[PDB]
Design a protein around this ligand. Structure first.
Ligand SMILES: NC(=O)C1=CN([C@@H]2O[C@H](COP(=O)(O)OP(=O)(O)OC[C@H]3O[C@@H](n4cnc5c(N)ncnc54)[C@H](OP(=O)(O)O)[C@@H]3O)[C@@H](O)[C@H]2O)C=CC1
Ligand SMILES: CCc1nc(N)nc(N)c1OCCCOc1ccccc1/C=C1\CCOC1=O
Length: 186
């Protein structure tokens, strides 16, 4: 099993979601960026694993459920089996990560991507160890009901560039955004 990573798109006021949707209108290339970063795996013969909470899973349109080319794990304590189209179900983030080291997955998983929501981000980010945050900064305020947790910059170093990540400002539908990578190791 390779690195542990979070990936998120967040508005200036730290919003990630509103009523099960994005706070902003669809940004097609931002979605393509999310698809590319979580799907691309260098290690031959393996796939990355995506971890998400239940509400994040049901936010994805059925057309894109499961996220293709990746192993899909859903976090829930109420569900008794993985939702339709999902691959795995765990009752805690710790259980999910431990599962990646079981023989069932031991040599199939390259990178692990936490793709939401807020509680899963928070726990991963505040758990000691080596972690990266791939953060798309939507550079406008958007009305939201779900927020990304605080990034402790004493711990998380903003990297000055990163291979495969555009450093310049993007713009879709009149909305400017930029890609960032943070890294901690504690
Ligand atoms: N902009 C972006 O980058 C992203 C946007 N989104 C949006 O963000 C919002 C997400 O809302 P949020 O409430 O954060 O959704 P979550 O994906 O966090 O769903 C939360 C549910 O997942 C389960 N769950 C969460 N953490 C754990 C855990 N550690 N162990 C076990 N079960 C767990 C619980 O389900 P139960 O009650 O069944 O136990 C909980 O009720 C949505 O609007 C979504 O559309 C989603 C992802 C990223
Ligand atoms: C592209 C958004 C994004 N961006 C970055 N940087 N990180 C993320 N973790 C992320 O969320 C991906 C899972 C959440 O997904 C959705 C959430 C709300 C509404 C729709 C979707 C899924 C869609 C819309 C386009 O087609 C899909 O599959």
């Amino acid at each position: 099993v390779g690195s542990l990573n979070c990936i998120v798109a967040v508005s200036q006021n730290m919003g990630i979601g509103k009523n099960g949707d994005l706070p902003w209108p669809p940004l097609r290339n931002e979605f393509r960026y999310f698809q590319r970063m979580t799907t691309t795996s260098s290690v031959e013969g393996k796939q990355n694993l995506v971890i998400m909470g239940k509400k994040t899973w049901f936010s994805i349109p059925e057309k894109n459920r499961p996220l293709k080319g990746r192993i899909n794990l859903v976090l829930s304590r109420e569900l008794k089996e993985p939702p339709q189209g999902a691959h795995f179900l765990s009752r805690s983030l710790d259980d999910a990560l431990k599962l990646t080291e079981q023989p069932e997955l031991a040599n199939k998983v390259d990178m692990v991507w936490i793709v939401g929501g807020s509680s899963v981000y928070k726990e991963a980010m505040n758990h000691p160890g080596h972690l990266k945050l791939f953060v798309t900064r939507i550079m406008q305020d958007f009305e939201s009901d779900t927020f990304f947790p605080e990034i402790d910059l004493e711990k998380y170093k903003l990297l000055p560039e990163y291979p495969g990540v555009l450093s310049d400002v993007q713009e879709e539908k009149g909305i400017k955004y930029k890609f960032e990578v943070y890294e901690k190791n504690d």
